[PDB]
Curated annotation (Swiss-Prot):
The chain holds residues 62 to 199 of 857 of the full protein. Present in rapidly proliferating cell lines. The gene is TTK. The modification Phosphoserine is found at residue 22. It comes from Homo sapiens (Human). Belongs to the protein kinase superfamily. Ser/Thr protein kinase family. Involved in mitotic spindle assembly checkpoint signaling, a process that delays anaphase until chromosomes are bioriented on the spindle, and in the repair of incorrect mitotic kinetochore-spindle microtubule attachments. Phosphorylates MAD1L1 to promote the mitotic spindle assembly checkpoint. Phosphorylates CDCA8/Borealin leading to enhanced AURKB activity at the kinetochore. Phosphorylates SKA3 at 'Ser-34' leading to dissociation of the SKA complex from microtubules and destabilization of microtubule-kinetochore attachments. Phosphorylates KNL1, KNTC1 and autophosphorylates. This is Dual specificity protein kinase TTK. Interacts with TPR; the interactions occurs in a microtubule-independent manner. Interacts with MAD1L1 and MAD2L1.
Length: 141
């Protein structure tokens, strides 16, 4: 069975081929991400960055499709991929978008306390939250 890097490569190609986006194409994409998650045991991949990207994208797609039921998918991604700062920032971004500023800050502070990496990404996110910006992270690379 293919690993997370092979699955992510297929999933990103499907996202590129799902333009212009529609409800039907969004449902198809979410379905394909669920198939990757069903095929990838989290106990083998907790330290895998491509696996963290798969779990985060599923949660982000669910936040578009049904924001009132997306929290559990961010909690799953954080439970499985806690090492990566971008996982915690994605959850904090979701909370911020829902108007839960206090929860967004607590998620970022807990990630700093628990040593999610890289630290710099978390400091930028905390600065942007304190500056009252809508996005914790801009078009960053």
């Amino acid at each position: 069975g293919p690993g997370p890097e092979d699955w992510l490569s297929l999933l990103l190609k499907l996202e590129k081929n799902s333009v212009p986006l529609s409800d039907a194409l969004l449902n198809k994409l979410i379905g394909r991400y669920s198939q990757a998650i069903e095929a990838l045991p989290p106990d083998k991949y907790g330290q895998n960055e491509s696996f963290a990207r798969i779990q985060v994208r599923f949660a982000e797609l669910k936040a578009i499709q049904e924001p009132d039921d997306a929290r559990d998918y961010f909690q799953m991604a954080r439970a499985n991929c806690k090492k990566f700062a971008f996982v915690h920032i994605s959850f904090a971004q979701f909370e911020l978008s829902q108007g839960n500023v206090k929860k967004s800050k607590q998620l970022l502070q807990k990630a700093v306390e628990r040593g999610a990496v890289p630290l710099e990404m978390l400091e930028i996110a905390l600065r942007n939250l304190n500056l009252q910006k809508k996005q914790l992270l801009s078009e960053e690379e």
